[PDB]
A paper describes a structure:
As reference we determined the substrate-free enzyme at atomic resolution (1.0 Å) to identify possible changes upon inhibitor binding. The solvent channels are large enough to allow ligand diffusion from the crystal surface to the active sites and therefore making this crystal form perfectly suitable for successful soaking experiments. The structure of the native enzyme can be super-positioned with the Bortezomib and Ixazomib complex with root-mean-square deviations (RMSD) of 0.11 and 0.14 Å, respectively, using all atoms of the polypeptide and without remarkable positional deviations of any residues. No induced-fit mechanism upon inhibitor binding takes place and all active site residues remain in the position as in the substrate-free enzyme. In our crystal structure of the native enzyme at a resolution of 1.0 Å, using phosphate-free crystallization conditions, this site is occupied by a sulphate ion. In the inhibitor-free CTX-M-14 and in the Bortezomib and Ixazomib complexes Lys73Nζ is in the identical position.
The clinical usefulness of β-lactam-based antibiotics has been significantly shortened by the emergence of specific bacterial enzymes referred to as β-lactamases (BL), able to hydrolyze and functionally inactivate β-lactam antibiotics. In this study we show the crystal structures of the β-lactamase CTX-M-14 with covalently bound Bortezomib and Ixazomib at high resolutions of 1.3 and 1.1 Å, respectively. Ixazomib is well defined in electron density whereas Bortezomib show some disorder which corresponds to weaker inhibition efficiency observed for Ixazomib. Both inhibitors mimic the deacylation transition state of β-lactam hydrolysis, because they replace the deacylating water molecule.
Residue numbers in the entry: 25 to 57, 59 to 238, 240 to 288
């Protein structure tokens, strides 16, 4: 059975030619609205939130950890390194790496976070520690974005990621200073203007992390503070049938516009 919300999302999906996954949590009353909420989708760069959060968790017991400088070698650079390339043969602190990974989607920065955590499995272990039984990180950048249909590597579900993002930003999966820091990073994202944010009222404050990958995979996860009412968490995942499909951030904006109604 479907609601009119789900019907509108299904029509958007049909028009788009792809596969859309949505999870909304309204923290006013803890209700969820889901569309394909328990299907797996390739996370692509949305997985950077879990890696940054895992380092924040480490820093709760190692208070200067975020200011620890990490060497950037020429050999560390991958396919998209807008911030890390400014620091070759120099350093970036774990905070700088987190900001670059989250706010510019720097892929070298993500690999440094993964290395700090002992490999992709260290990111997954943190997910499990905070009650996310669904997330899995299997690979580093850039291969975590292959996004092959049916492949469970580097996937989660909309429901699981919405629940986790809520716990990380509005709940207490992290300590107070750390939750606030994650919120600061997400709010300052530079890559999200055409995704969820484009579908929401401009008066609403938004923190988000986008993702993109093969199969035209186009994703965004957000914490949203509407005017005059309790915050929301929204995940919008989208992927397409053919490997070289074009990005469709407009689909994410359209999904957010549907969800915001009412």
């Amino acid at each position: 059975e479907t609601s009119a919300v789900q019907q509108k999302l299904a029509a958007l999906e049909k028009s788009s030619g792809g596969r859309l996954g949505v999870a909304l949590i309204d923290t006013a009353d803890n209700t969820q609205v889901l569309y394909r909420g328990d299907e797996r989708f390739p996370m692509c760069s949305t997985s950077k939130v879990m890696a940054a959060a895992a380092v924040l968790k480490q820093s709760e017991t190692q208070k200067q950890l975020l200011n620890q400088p990490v060497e950037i070698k020429p050999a560390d650079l991958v396919n998209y390194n807008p911030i890390a390339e400014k620091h070759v043969n120099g350093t970036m602190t774990l905070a700088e790496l987190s900001a670059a990974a989250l706010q510019y989607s720097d892929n070298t920065a993500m690999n440094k976070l993964i290395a700090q955590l002992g490999g992709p499995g260290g990111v997954t272990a943190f997910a499990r520690a905070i009650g996310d039984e669904t997330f899995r990180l299997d690979r580093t950048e850039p291969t975590l974005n292959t996004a092959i249909p049916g492949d469970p590597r580097d996937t989660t579900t909309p429901r699981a990621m919405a629940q986790t993002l809520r716990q990380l930003t509005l709940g207490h999966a992290l300590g107070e200073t750390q939750r606030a820091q994650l919120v600061t990073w997400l709010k300052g994202n530079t890559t999200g203007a055409a995704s969820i944010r484009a579908g929401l009222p401009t008066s609403w404050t938004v923190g988000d992390k986008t993702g993109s990958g093969d199969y035209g995979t186009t994703n965004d996860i957000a914490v949203i503070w509407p005017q005059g009412r309790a915050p929301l968490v929204l995940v919008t995942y989208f992927t397409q049938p053919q490997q070289n499909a074009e990005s469709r951030r407009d689909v994410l904006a359209s999904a957010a516009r549907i969800i915001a109604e009412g």
